[PDB]
RNA sequence: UAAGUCAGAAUCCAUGCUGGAAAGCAAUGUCUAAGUGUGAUGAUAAACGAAAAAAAAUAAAAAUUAAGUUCGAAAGGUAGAGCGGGGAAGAGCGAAAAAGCUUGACCUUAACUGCUAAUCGUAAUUCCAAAUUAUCAUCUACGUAAAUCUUUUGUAGACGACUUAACAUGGAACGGGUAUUGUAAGCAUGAGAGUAGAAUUUCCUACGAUCUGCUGAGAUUCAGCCCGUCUCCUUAGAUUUAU
RNA sequence: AGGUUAGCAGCCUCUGGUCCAUAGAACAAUGUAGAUAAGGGAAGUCGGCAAAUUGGAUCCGUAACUUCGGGAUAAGGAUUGGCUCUGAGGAUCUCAGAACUGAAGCGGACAAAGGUAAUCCGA
RNA sequence: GAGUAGGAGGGCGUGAUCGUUGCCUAGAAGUAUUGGGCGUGAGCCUAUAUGGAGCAGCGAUUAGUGCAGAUCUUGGUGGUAGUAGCAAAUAUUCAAAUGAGAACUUUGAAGACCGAAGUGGAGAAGGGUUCCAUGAGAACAGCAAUUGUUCAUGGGUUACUCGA
RNA sequence: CACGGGAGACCGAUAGCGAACAAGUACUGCGAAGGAAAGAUGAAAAGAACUUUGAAAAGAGGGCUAAAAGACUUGAAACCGU
């Protein structure tokens, strides 16, 4: 196998994957849900989620989260100077009008 | 101090110890009564619990409150998908007990029940039986099913539960060993052949109106406090530590607990024999009428709207039981005949079937069918499709 | 009733039922690389014929008061002899804990014959069999099957444990179904108590809760619902047992 | 400081300050705190302990007893939103009417008495 | 040929003093011993190892002279046990930077709280340098820390009208 | 009792004054008053040069010295690891 720099749009479910978890924690629950997500899709241990992302996330406050998110994840050449894996991923947050078409993919050339 | 108002104890001893069981599937530790009176019949069967609806049945059974009136009654579905038979068992009576003379194995052994031996069948190479095959000799078998003849006081068929049939995670079949009741050691052996490598159907085994017994596992509820457990009575709500206890352990002497006593532990997943379930109907997963009456005149599966929760859509035949019984749905099944053959009331009842309800469970719903839902709001599907 | 017989209880024992790590047993699937591999040292509440198969009856019989029997029993050698002893394969039979019995290539041995015994010095276990198995060392084989962790399921769960999946009948996302709420936003040359202004004098305009239509709409629906999918992720690594 | 309001109450905000209280995951029993239970209604219990009911404002209506002050929110009965109009009180912000409109809801959060009849003490 | 309370006769072992006989940098005292022995027993002698400066016998003299205990004194240590536990005062999250290391430091971006009866701005009592800046190993800040009320070094408190 | 002298069948760091030592000290108490713990590297600092791995503590090499005796003489028991 080679390890080549990947990106794949999807929406993560909150209504799903942040369900049922107590209210003061949702908001930062689901951000740990789309790190996890992150890691067993790309294969990195380095993650990063993009500030917009996290806004949105947030954008709710802490109890009421949107219930879906679009996300790219990038996963990119870790060029830093002290370098532990050759890889890491940013979750990146697009703006979506309806949810309802959507599937994950490899994200398009535009 | 004699107790001071003297009420039943908490909890059936019968019942303890508490613990979860080993046995997954039913486990008869008795098969019925065995009687030289009837060519040999299969004792018992496998299914799986689907779902629960209810009836409306016309009731002859005279003498009885409901004698010639429309009564609504609880019943449970268990999708009973073929069985497949896989060997013979031979069992000699020895002063230790009985004991497993020698198994007989067919030729064919699909893949899913080799499973059995495996925790998981694709990281394996999948070796299991070669040897039976490749140095398979009939004359042998002939010779071991004679030897059975000879030396033989009891014969079961090794029966195999095909999951394929179903929609379930589990594909991994299941093995049964389900004995064989008829007058002559002899016969029973030849019967058992005669089934190797064949397709049973529940209709082989149980009828309608007859009396069942249902062999399978409590559902799971985990560990659970005294007054769930054995339904001790709650202590005064004003309680220091705290009323969902028993108030007290034992008396001073003995210097112990006695094994008497409840206590907190596991509920839950246990193996229950539950007897004297009544069939109010067995179909065959072709009839996309099964779910329907003489009363009704109209095509019903008996898959509910939206299908059984938890469970799935059934296709394959089934048996439909009076009443509840144990287990979550899904949680397979081993239906037993009667130990002996029931003879009382409820058993002779002849069951007149009249509405048989196939409206959703999911919600509250008032749909028997598509169709209805459809006439009701004005969309035809059969119009969308063309 | 003493022998001998019948009836006979919510009793007793069973049957049924739940446990069943009883440091019990059986049947069956696959595997155990390489040899009926060898060497040394060892342990086993007890090897020196530690010998031995009728069945039943004790007020039976024609008749026998004791396993107080019977069988085996030569040199802990060699060379011959060979009464006799033991048994491959395969084919037979044999199951209460299958322990073995038959046949049988062949393997072996007693009388008898010759050597050899003595200096193990008037005793000091007569150290050798059989069934088991430990340890160390080594020769050949560098393989085979399976499991576990890192995943997965929620029929299970405090944690372990358990059911179940393993490149896709899995997981994700999405489509449809079923269901809950109760008719979303936005429009309206439709209705609306009544007010104000323009307009022309039986109207226009503005404001207006609310009604009505578009709309049984809109929203949500597995995270332990159901059916389905073009798409996306999982094919790697480590560990354990037989070694 | 602003909004609501009788209000320096409560609830929400602006200025200024702060997220400091070891963390992650699971979600059993038992517990600590918070709520809700069909039918009955103290049968529970030494005991209504605890809980529940009541609660603002406007309009009605208001006993015995009495030291004539009181009792007194006695007891009890109604109303409360929104919207469109109408009238009255004043200088060189209160009060009252009418009509229309809703799942007959409207002190919608917040705030906020449960009554009655007796007995004993102490004014 | 028994023996508690008790009494008597002999003996073991420890300081120091007057004598007497001696031993030790060619290794005294002390210490450890599954080395070898001696006493019925207090106790003894030796061997080996360690140790690195004082010791020992015999006759007397003298005694702060022998410990398993007294909820005994002081000191040192266990098991419990990686256990009970670290849960009041609603809350955190993302990226960058710094660093060996960041859930706990700094900037920015979000979300919440105290809500002018404050988690705001200043005083009296009390504290006394805790204030400011730079730097930082251990310890302390009951997790952590690149941070500090902590450590180190330097520097800060001006009055006719404020108060005494 | 104070400053001096000399001495002893005294005591010998849990003993001896409470204090062998920055001891009537640290510390506590509004106060009157209470009041400890704490002595021995070596003849000489010769107190560990230098190499190497570490962010650092430190380890491994290497060295002083009669000996590491290295925060220090001897180094018992309880307790703990191999
Ligand atoms: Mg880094
Ligand atoms: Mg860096
Ligand atoms: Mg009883
Ligand atoms: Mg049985
Ligand atoms: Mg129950
Ligand atoms: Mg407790
Ligand atoms: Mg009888
Ligand atoms: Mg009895
Ligand atoms: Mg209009
Ligand atoms: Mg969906
Ligand atoms: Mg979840
Ligand atoms: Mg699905
Ligand atoms: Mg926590
Ligand atoms: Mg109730
Ligand atoms: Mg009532
Ligand atoms: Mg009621
Ligand atoms: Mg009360
Ligand atoms: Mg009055
Ligand atoms: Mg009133
Ligand atoms: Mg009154
Ligand atoms: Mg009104
Ligand atoms: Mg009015
Ligand atoms: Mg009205
Ligand atoms: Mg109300
Ligand atoms: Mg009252
Ligand atoms: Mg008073
Ligand atoms: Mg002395
Ligand atoms: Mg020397
Ligand atoms: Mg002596
Ligand atoms: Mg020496
Ligand atoms: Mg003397
Ligand atoms: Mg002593
Ligand atoms: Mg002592
Ligand atoms: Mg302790
Ligand atoms: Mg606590
Ligand atoms: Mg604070
Ligand atoms: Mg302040
Ligand atoms: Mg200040
Ligand atoms: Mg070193
Ligand atoms: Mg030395
Ligand atoms: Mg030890």
Redesign the pocket.
């Not at chain 1, 990063?48 to 500030?51: A, E, L, M, S, Y």
């Given at each position: 196998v080679k390890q080549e720099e990947?990106s794949?749009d999807?929406?993560?479910?909150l209504?799903?994957?942040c369900?049922?978890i107590?209210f003061?924690?949702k908001a930062?629950?689901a951000?740990?849900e789309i790190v996890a997500i992150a890691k067993?899709?790309m294969?990195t241990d380095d993650v990063?989620?993009?500030?917009e992302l996290?806004?949105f996330i947030?954008?709710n406050?802490?109890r009421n989260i949107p219930?879906?998110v679009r996300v790219r994840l990038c996963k990119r050449k870790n060029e830093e100077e002290?370098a532990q894996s050759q890889f890491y991923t940013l979750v990146q947050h697009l703006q979506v009008d309806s949810?309802?078409?959507?599937?994950?993919?490899?994200t398009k050339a535009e | 101090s004699h107790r001071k108002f003297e009420a039943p104890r908490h909890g059936s001893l019968?019942?303890?110890?508490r613990?979860?069981?080993?046995?997954?599937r039913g486990r008869?530790?008795?098969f019925p009564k065995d009687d030289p009176s009837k060519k040999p019949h299969l004792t018992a069967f496998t299914g799986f619990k689907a779902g629960m609806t209810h009836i409306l049945r016309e009731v002859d059974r005279s003498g009885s409150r409901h004698n010639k009136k429309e009564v609504v009654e609880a019943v449970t579905v268990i999708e009973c998908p073929p069985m497949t038979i896989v060997g013979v068992?031979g069992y000699?009576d020895?002063?230790?007990?009985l004991?497993?003379?020698?198994?007989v194995?067919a030729k064919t052994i699909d893949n899913n029940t080799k499973?059995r031996?495996?925790?998981?069948?694709?990281?394996?190479?999948?070796?299991?039986?070669?040897?039976?095959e490749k140095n398979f000799d009939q004359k042998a078998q002939d010779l071991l099913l004679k030897?059975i003849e000879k030396?033989c006081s009891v014969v079961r068929v090794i029966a195999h539960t095909n999951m394929?049939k179903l929609?379930?995670?589990?594909?991994?079949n299941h093995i049964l060993e389900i004995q064989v009741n008829g007058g002559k050691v002899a016969e029973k052996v030849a019967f058992a052949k005669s089934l190797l490598e064949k397709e049973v159907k529940v209709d082989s085994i149980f009828a309608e109106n007859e009396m069942l017994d249902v062999?399978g596992v409590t559902?799971?509820?985990?560990?659970?406090?005294?007054?769930?457990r054995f339904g001790v009575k709650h202590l005064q709500k004003?309680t220091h530590?705290?009323?969902?206890?028993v108030g007290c352990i034992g008396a001073w002497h003995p210097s112990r607990i006695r094994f008497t006593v409840p206590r907190?532990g596991?509920l839950?997943?246990?193996?229950?024999?539950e007897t004297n379930k009544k069939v109010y109907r067995v179909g065959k997963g072709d009839d996309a009428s099964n779910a329907s009456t003489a009363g009704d005149v109209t095509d019903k599966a008996i898959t509910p709207?939206?299908?059984?929760?938890?469970?799935?859509?059934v296709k394959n035949d089934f048996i439909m039981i009076k009443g509840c019984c144990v287990?979550?749905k899904?949680?397979v099944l081993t239906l037993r005949k009667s130990?002996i053959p029931q003879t009382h009331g409820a058993a002779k009842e002849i069951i007149n079937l009249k509405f048989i309800d196939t409206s959703?469970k999911?919600?509250?719903?008032?749909?028997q069918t598509?169709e209805e839902?459809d006439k009701?709001?004005?969309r035809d599907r059969t119009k969308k499709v063309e």
């Open positions: 990947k794949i999807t929406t993560v479910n209504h799903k994957q369900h049922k107590s003061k924690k930062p629950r951000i740990r067993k899709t294969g990063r989620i993009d500030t996290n806004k947030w954008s406050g802490i219930r879906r002290g949810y309802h078409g959507l599937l994950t993919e490899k | 019968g019942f303890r110890p613990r979860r069981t080993r046995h997954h008869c530790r008795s068992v000699i020895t002063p230790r007990g004991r497993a003379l020698t198994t194995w499973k031996f495996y925790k998981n069948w694709a990281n394996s190479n999948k070796k299991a039986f070669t040897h039976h030897r030396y394929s929609n379930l995670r589990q594909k991994k062999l559902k799971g509820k985990g560990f659970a406090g005294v007054i769930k004003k530590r705290g009323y969902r206890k907190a596991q839950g997943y246990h193996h229950r024999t709207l939206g299908g059984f929760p938890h469970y799935g859509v287990g979550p899904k949680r130990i959703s999911i919600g509250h719903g008032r749909f598509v839902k009701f709001f004005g």
